[model samples]
Target: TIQPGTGYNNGYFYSYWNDGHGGVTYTNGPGGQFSVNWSNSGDFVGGKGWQPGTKNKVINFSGSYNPNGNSYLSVYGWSRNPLIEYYIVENFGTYNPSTGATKLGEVTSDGSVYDIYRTQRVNQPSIIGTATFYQYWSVRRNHRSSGSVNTANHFNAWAQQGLTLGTMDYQIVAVQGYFSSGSASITVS
Candidate 1:
């Protein structure tokens, strides 16, 4: 019951954003909800909110999303100035995020504990051209499909660990799959 396309819907941006070589079918539903079906090397679907997301409003997300392969379910976003990409990882499949990253510490939010991580990406495509940037992450120890992420909690935790953010760009409820065939969906109210 989903029509396939892309772009903004009621202030939220929806897209079948990919790194490369993925056959993905997606649809933007009303009020920022979206769904995707795919078989590919990589694919991403997101419900992106207003610009200048910063350490802004608290985001409460509930969804019945099932990720079937190498993937992640996260509240993702970016920032300028300091140039950072961040993730509040809620759940995943087959990919242990702790690998290939430095664990900064742990933080408690939305009634769960999350491990903080920082990784530097060199010469990567970012919101501001090709550049080197740091990725900030809070990956939940206990993966869940529905929860609340009070931005201040993570932002504060990062700051405590000396991980600073810059001017906010766009924040999103992001679902991703890579190097495998999978299907996923999200509804953001």
Candidate 2:
């Protein structure tokens, strides 16, 4: 159940989950079009799944992706500590493949082709001492149609490749457009 104007404390119809530690504002347009403006700072800020638990599911986001600075329009899945972050599109940022990240071929979903990458981050010191995690990303090199961006949970995809990050029961938690610095907007229907 997603109440339109209830998650962010800024008097807007937006929801906050995970690391969306930034301010947000929403504008309702004519028809069924709605716009969301997220501040550039949060690691994850966008429409989130309202379901509970993890399962093999297909989540679709329909909208126009517009960025203001260094931002990424992506879909993410994670458990408490271990996670997989996939960027559907990115404008401006440093991507050095030599740093423990590998290009893992491509995956086509919802009329869009995505370049997948496999990477692992080790011994990252967090508030709970230290944590190590692996990530599999399927990023679109080119932006897709201006409506309906869809992606599935990567658990089955990772399993097919025999890649294991311990347990295979992590939750598919987020669908977001992360903005690192500046501002960004996405229209969802």
Candidate 3:
């Protein structure tokens, strides 16, 4: 079943949604896992992960992800103390987030190189509220569908650039689709 809202199951937060202009069907499993089918002109972002995401462990994931249009798959999450939203894009679609972004140097992580970009979102929707905040992006040079993300390495890299992360929030392997079609089946460990 597809829930176009949000929920929690087996210690993981699961969210699914669409803006009524498109279609979204998704279901989450125990822990960090989910399957989704989406199409058309709307946009949706669904993820499965812990409410207080782990910062001391490596996030390893694998999946069968295919996107025919605009889409994104990443180790996504939020932090509270600094109220920052961050994305470690492992794979992407037609549109890339790093295009025209403010470059904040780069780091080689988890056998792949990533360009770190810092972008400010003013009055956009946030995990806390509709407040201004910064988004930290580690857009991968070589896109991949499955791999291990050394979270600590990225954190260290951000710290080098004076981008400090705060308390951990809901973090998950999040997938997003916009004006496109895609399907994914993923499991995280």
Candidate 4:
């Protein structure tokens, strides 16, 4: 129902109900409201309030809206629930995304912050072997309403050992969507 630069994740998806139609408006970012229009073909419209890539990474709930007879409100982006989870059981020390060796932090369930040191050990198993480190993070927010959940911005970083010197291979994975109330933001020095 929508055109380019206007779709869920990137593509346009519509939902057809007895009342009318509905679909995700666009990718939600900071300074914007993730909205839905139940009457206008059920298209969920993203508010211009939050602009993508902005420093303000907060999502505020406006209220509920009903286009046809059904009433509903749009939250953040949509993502899968009970998503794939993994942990660093092995410890290979700290790593960096750009270059050199550096320390990183993991996200806690209560939205706490932590740092991972190179001296730490990660002993987890993935498609790779065991090593000395552990990190617990979520992919998206856990939603109990509408039977739909969204992804989060928590991810883990790992360094490969096969490389020579001054080179590191890191693996990073994250869930989709944003939080409902507060903003989940992180900065490293």
Please report the candidate that would top lDDT against the real structure. 3
1 or 4: which has the higher TM-score? 1
Q: Rank order by lDDT, top first? A: 3, 1, 2, 4
Clashes of each: 1, 1, 0, 34
Q: CA lDDT of each candidate?
A: 0.77, 0.44, 0.85, 0.24
Worst 10 residues of 3 by lDDT: 1-10
**TM-score to true structure, per model:** 0.90, 0.57, 0.93, 0.21
Candidate 3 residue lDDT tens string, 1-189? 465876787666766767777666788876677887877647888877667786765888888889879999999998988999999999998999878999998999988899999999999888777999999999999989889998888888998998899999878888888988889888877
Tens digits of per-residue lDDT for model 1, 1-189: 233334577767654566556566666666767666667656555554555575856876666666667788888888888999998999988886667889999999988999999999999887788999999999998888777789889999999999999888878787777766566667664
Per-residue lDDT tens digits of candidate 2, residues 49-88?
A: 3223243444444555555544455444344434433334
lDDT of 3: 0.85
Candidates 1 and 2, the one with greater TM-score: 1
Q: Is candidate 2 or candidate 4 better by TM-score?
A: 2
Name the regions of candidate 1 deviating beyond 4 angstroms.
Answer: 1-6, 43-45
TM-score of 4: 0.21
Q: Is candidate 1 or candidate 4 better by lDDT?
A: 1
Q: Residue 110: error of model 2 in Å?
A: 1.7
Deviation from native of the Cα of residue 25 in model 1, angstroms: 1.8
